[PDB]
Design a protein around this ligand. Sequence first.
Ligand code: AP3
Length: 265
Amino acid sequence: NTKGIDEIKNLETDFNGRIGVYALDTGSGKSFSYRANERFPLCSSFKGFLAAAVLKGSQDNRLNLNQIVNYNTRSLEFHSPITTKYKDNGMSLGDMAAAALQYSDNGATNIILERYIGGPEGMTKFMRSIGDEDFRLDRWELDLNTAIPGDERDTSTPAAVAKSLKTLALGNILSEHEKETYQTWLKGNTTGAARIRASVPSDWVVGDKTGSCGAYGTANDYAVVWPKNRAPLIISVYTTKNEKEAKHEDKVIAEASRIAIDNLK
Ligand SMILES: *C(=O)[C@@H]([C@@H]1N[C@@H](C(=O)O)C(C)(C)S1)C(C)(C)O
């Protein structure tokens, strides 16, 4: 059978859940897919796209990344490591957008969704405008993390996630300068050491955004991977389980990425 398909099937069987993967080599055009068209919860992964929406607004001159966002009288959401630190005097919209991505900051995420993106509807609308028919954000943080089997709320497909990431990071939606900023933000992510980053050799450069729902063993990661002396790779790995109390498995996500990279065709 086709390279790596059985291996990913076996990984999935051992994991006892559902694994969805889509990897693309932008240099050769080769790819690897497994349940790439199935829905999986986005969890915090959508924040990487929220950052891109902010960048598009900047480019459109509908907003300015230098604008100081004040929230000294707003209580911050669970897991707001950066916004909590700067709550007294606020932070630029640019720094807040970066924090939402790099630290999965929930305060930054909800503040930006409210004041600049138009909430879940606006986020969904932005993705629709770039060609993504699958992505759907329906709830705010941290309600969007339920990850209930069969529930289509706050889900997307590994393929759609990959298509959108390539469109944003390597397409022409964002201008050259905004893409540089987006790629820089992705490269500075602090939460993906055990996922896609763990599947590639040390000299490859990774830019990613992880997502961990904390329910139904749901976790994911997507990334732009720059191999030494090669064109970028777009990797999208999403996983889920049927037990509500099951824990996520970083090793499984990493192995699915390794398999995909090694089996492009
Ligand atoms: C999103 O899934 C989650 C935050 N992001 C994950 C991750 O990126 O792996 C953390 C474990 C860092 S916390 C919540 C807190 C649900 O928004």
